[PDB]
Design a protein around this ligand. Structure first.
Ligand SMILES: *C[C@H]1C[C@@H](C(=O)O)C=C1NCc1c(COP(=O)(O)O)cnc(C)c1O
Ligand SMILES: *C[C@H]1C[C@@H](C(=O)O)C=C1NCc1c(COP(=O)(O)O)cnc(C)c1O
Lengths: 404, 404
């Protein structure tokens, strides 16, 4: 017979690096909102691969785009032109109303590109002396595992044992306008990079007016507002961008994950000419960035998001989901938070009972969620879920919670 | 009507970042060693997407692997297990005879991972004081475009205007054993990272015995030998790894590009347990790293390399290519160098005539190659090329070179 779940666990333990401690479940099939393991058990996916499958697993239109393009051409490198990249660039720039896009593959590559753009713009446009440019980040931020990304982190597990760290990165508290103003008193600050909702920190939603104030402060002090929407963008929070909830237009928008529906690593950096063109030919890029296969996939994924009106569905069903989650008793769940279909709950962890055990029992009851910090549980199903499926999942959550 | 080549160029110029200056050709289809542009013209590919299509464009076995897997499951994230990753891990670790592999997406991510492993091993195993660990690089190195990667570069196009730079990186001349011996006197050096052949520097081949001397010196001074085989590995130079020419075993091996045949961004970090297991769960990773689709693709790409004996073909045909190129007069071609099918020529660049014009005329005569700097032209066709096709393309190169 084929491998069992424990066979798969043991094989990975033997031949793979131990850089993850995943939830004990071995998936082999995904379709829409559902996942199946090698034993044939069916699960609601309430993580959505950290929003990479906002469109559901293996969405047939994105799958068809990939299958169609793979027989024609997949990679020429950027040493030559392919016929697909410009179509995708026009589509996405007109969709988000920026002059230009720079394509990359992973989220952390988009963040590194944004840091390089901010620095080059600080030196060549703002007039900062080389190399004194600073980039400000918010405590609790997460945007990857490169040495640069962990150099801006306040999480010891990310940076411990990996120094020395990148200079020129400053950290202020999240959701703190006065701290940002104080930080931006320094004319050598080139940019402020921030998530409109901090996902990895436990779905931390800042107060109303925070993004508006960030925009005002960055514009006043000639500082680039970099909005990291790699997790929050593309309809997950109920809008094309979480930033849309306050009509805020960042200087640089970072997109990823759902940009491909999970079929290909695609990320994007969006900004206007005065920022984008500070990087001259030969000064940045990557081998797979902007390849025709990923571009076909991304066009199809964006089209799925727009056609099926997934942002509106996420807004409505997230209202329903948060309202049902708040019905849970306050001595088992202390906080419910989120926007759209990016939500989390906080349990009052005991020494006996924590979020990992709750997620194990949810797994046993047919729903897959991931815990965080030992007391946070994220609930983020694909945006193609319907109300009846959502209510079945909600009753599963209720039964599992109050079954302890 | 469909876009012409000029339409494609202009659309990318309007909506895409200007971080590249590609050779003016607009490809829409590729198969094996050949590419087709939107006008229908046919070209020999003599770049192979920087060795990412060692197997040729759209190799049917890799295409079939991708198409078969995309119907089942493409991404769960590493919060759960997928059934494919362990199969790939066992396969690649047995193939290259290392204990473990850490999967990533891009080559620069593999390099960042190796730097983090080297630092973590230096602090927790070698005993280096935090945070004094150093990594030594060779001048001319290229391993990507992150802030860290450009901090080790000696190419001003890579780093100028993007600082401040990552501390703890030292640079010595390439192909220089006395310099490495001097550098490794510092007990704070944790690793030496080097390409067996410097590709982006213009196919710089070190002298015989260099790699044996590197291995010897790294062992003598308890320093990790990191071999970047992202461009040189996987049959391109005539061996599974370029380091096989001297039969030395690096402590860490970096693989990428051809690892997927150009169908998916897949990279890998190979090392034994005493290095790999310094990274604990939660300290490194990536969202698309080790996803099932990329793993199926990589298995098929490695199997293609093995079954079609592409290393032997590269070894046999590369010497034919180099011997023919050396027959060009020294008035035009001043140097020929390479290993296997990774080759380059140096032309006697005047102010009237340079590598760019040679490549434009090569394009006009049906062969695609791109220059680095003003005098280097790489010749690296896919490893599935046959001898008669190679001699036809050699005729093209001869006619083009001598037509000036
Ligand atoms: C992809 C996902 C996985 C979780 C996790 O591992 O906990 C975090 C996600 N992405 C991190 C992230 C990035 C970097 O994305 P990568 O594709 O992994 O490089 C960028 N920006 C934000 C806001 C992120 O959360
Ligand atoms: C892949 C490639 C194409 C050009 C270019 O894009 O400008 C140069 C490349 N070689 C990169 C390289 C890396 C980094 O790999 P990425 O996938 O681009 O991140 C690492 N190591 C070596 C030896 C490389 O040549």
């Amino acid at each position: 017979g084929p491998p069992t779940s424990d066979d798969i666990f043991e094989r990975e333990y033997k031949y793979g690096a131990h850089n993850y401690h995943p939830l004990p479940v071995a998936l082999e099939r995904g379709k829409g909102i559902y996942l199946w393991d090698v034993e044939g058990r069916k699960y609601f996916d309430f993580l959505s691969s950290y929003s990479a499958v906002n469109q559901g697993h293996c969405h047939p239109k994105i799958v068809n785009a990939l299958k169609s393009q793979v027989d024609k051409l997949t990679l020429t490198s950027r040493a030559f032109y392919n016929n697909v990249l410009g179509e995708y660039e026009e589509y996405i720039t007109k969709l988000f109303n920026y002059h230009k896009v720079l394509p990359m593959n992973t989220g952390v590559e988009a963040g590194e590109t944004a840091c390089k753009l901010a620095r080059k713009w600080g030196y060549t446009v703002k007039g900062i002396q080389k190399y004194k440019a600073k980039i400000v980040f918010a405590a609790g931020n997460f945007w990857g595992r490169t040495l640069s990304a962990i150099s801006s982190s306040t999480d010891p597990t990310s940076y411990d044992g990996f120094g020395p760290f990148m200079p020129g990165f400053d950290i202020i508290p999240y959701n703190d306008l006065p701290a940002l103003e104080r930080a931006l008193q320094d004319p050598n600050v080139a940019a402020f990079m921030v998530e409109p909702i901090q996902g990895e920190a436990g779905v931390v939603v800042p107060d109303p007016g925070y993004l508006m104030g960030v925009r005002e402060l960055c514009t006043r002090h000639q500082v680039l507002f970099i909005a990291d929407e790699i997790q929050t963008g593309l309809a997950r929070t109920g809008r094309w961008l979480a930033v849309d909830y306050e009509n805020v237009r960042p200087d640089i928008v970072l997109l990823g994950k759902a940009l491909s529906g999970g079929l290909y690593p695609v990320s994007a950096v969006l900004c206007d000419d005065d920022i984008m063109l500070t990087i001259k030919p030969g000064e940045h890029g990557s081998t797979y960035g902007g390849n025709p296969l990923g571009c076909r996939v991304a066009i199809a994924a964006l089209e799925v998001l727009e056609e099926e009106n997934l942002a509106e569905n996420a807004d409505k069903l997230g209202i329903i989901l948060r309202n049902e989650l708040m019905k849970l008793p306050s001595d088992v769940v202390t906080a419910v938070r989120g926007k759209g279909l990016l939500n989390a709950i906080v349990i009052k962890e005991t020494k006996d009972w924590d979020a990992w055990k709750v997620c194990l029992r949810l797994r046993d009851n047919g729903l897959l969620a991931k815990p965080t910090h030992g007391d946070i549980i994220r609930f983020a199903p694909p945006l193609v879920i319907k109300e009846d499926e959502l209510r079945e999942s909600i009753e599963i959550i209720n039964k599992t919670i109050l079954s302890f």
